[PDB]
Amino acid sequence: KPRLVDIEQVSSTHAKVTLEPLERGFGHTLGNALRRILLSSMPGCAVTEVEIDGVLHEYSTKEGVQEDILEILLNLKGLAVRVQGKDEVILTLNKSGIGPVTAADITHDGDVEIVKPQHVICHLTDENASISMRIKVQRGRGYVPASTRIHSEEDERPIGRLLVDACYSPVERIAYNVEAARVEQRTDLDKLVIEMETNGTIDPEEAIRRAATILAEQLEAFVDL
Amino acid sequence: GQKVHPNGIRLGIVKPWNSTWFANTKEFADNLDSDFKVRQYLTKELAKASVSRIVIERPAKSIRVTIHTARPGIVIGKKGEDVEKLRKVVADIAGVPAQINIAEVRKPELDAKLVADSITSQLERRVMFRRAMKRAVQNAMRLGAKGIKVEVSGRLGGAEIARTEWYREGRVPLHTLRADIDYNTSEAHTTYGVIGVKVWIFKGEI
């Protein structure tokens, strides 16, 4: 079996994990299976519901903002968030004045972690102009669009609550590379090096461990039949 | 009399309070008071607004107030008419920055309040109690629901001998706390007497 070690951490987002001792056919197999798991099945947190002040629907324009409500909703999807203890958390963006909204600006409460202080949400282009939107975050498995979310709602009077396409996937890109190695007493052994890029809401060591656990639960039923 | 309030009896489970907030003996005294003034008034200028309930949240010197209504648009105003007025009327009435969020009533035929305020209004329109009481209320059974018990007080029609009426569909086991029912009253001061009415809508079980 392989021993997981040697974590070459490049940045907060990017990383390069390696698994040195692997059999002749164990380089491609696990790596390709993990690639299929990591991209498809990856638990995470992202924006779902948003309610903006002085805005009844999307496809309108707010006073004192150059970026439209439809354009803001798209920027909200790109914003990275990671929740430790809480399942769902509602943040509030209290800010005003001439200039760009850095990225944080929200009141820091509970277990909500923020990894983006530069990520642009919107630009304020007037003195008295003000914005105060309550943003909701939800936990899930995969990609859930806005079209699916209006079916089994049952009474959704909040018209201000403009819906967004949810994206519960931490990985941005994945790439494995198998290279030959000569360990302490060996003939022909592959070295699986898994290069992984993330949004920054979950660790690479934590993501790869959770991905392998999902495959074990699936393989558990296949033994006894 | 010999019946427990089918709503208060359940105020603990399966039934939320139409006014949830904290307060101490000090302000509590005048607190529930203002809530009455504001709530009583919100109906005066919004009777035909077809308003159901009227919750009242209270964090700290800023009550929320939610006017549930089958007719939201009319309770909205000319893109600011209604809202502004009310939202402002809550001025000295509570002496605090009081907001106001409207809630849309889904299927106004299953909500007690409405089904009650309606039948009573029809009565005031010179209409046979039996007809409306039965049919004009029977609808609550077509849009779904399982059981609806109506009740019209006495003095119905030309008569000095007040009489109560029955008429009920499905099942209304008001003897079950885990039953959850939509009960509400409604008067109708007509040419003579005050023909009352009570709506008992059994919206599913647990």
Partner: protein, 38 residues
């Protein structure tokens, strides 16, 4: 009426914005010369 009220408020805002840029700027410029001279 709500639309025409909003259209009237926006019309008063747009034309007043012209009178505040030009007419405030012109009024302060004429007044500044009068203070220097007098």
């Amino acid at each position: 009426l709500e639309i025409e009220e909003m259209q009237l408020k926006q019309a008063k805002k747009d034309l007043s914005e012209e009178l505040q840029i030009l007419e405030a700027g012109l009024f302060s410029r004429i007044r500044a010369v009068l203070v220097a001279g007098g």
